[PDB]
């Protein structure tokens, strides 16, 4: 109901954690397991590559259709670019229903 593709077997969840590396244990044994760990974190890169199957229009409409254009005007800030201090902003939501076809 939010829109999208309903999938019985969706893309599976990729779960990730840091392996716990404990600090120094005491000299004698104690079975109350571990509260002392080495405070750490990880970083890295992650790349996702989805292939999408397109469906071409077969339209026999005569007149021009409605497009998603950018307003060519004297603007202070370009749409869908970064700001004066590098904040990336998205000025409006873009749907996907622009082309037409008969019912």
């Amino acid at each position: 109901l939010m829109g999208g593709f309903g999938l019985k077997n969706p893309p599976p969840q990729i779960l990730i954690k840091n392996t716990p590396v404990p600090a120094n244990p005491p000299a004698e044994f104690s079975a109350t397991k571990f509260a002392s760990f080495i405070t750490q974190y990880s970083t890295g890169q992650v790349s996702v590559e989805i292939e999408w199957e397109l469906q071409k229009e077969n339209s026999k409409r005569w007149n021009p259709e409605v497009q998603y254009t950018s307003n060519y005007a004297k603007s202070a800030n370009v749409d869908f670019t970064v700001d004066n201090n590098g904040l990336y902003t998205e000025p409006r939501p873009i749907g996907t229903r622009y082309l037409t076809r008969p019912l």
Binding site: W62, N63, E65, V66, T100, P102
Partner: peptide, 12 residues
């Protein structure tokens, strides 16, 4: 409306 289509049938 701007999405009202027009069909010339000699373009077939």
């Amino acid at each position: 409306v701007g999405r009202s289509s027009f069909y010339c049938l000699e373009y077939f």
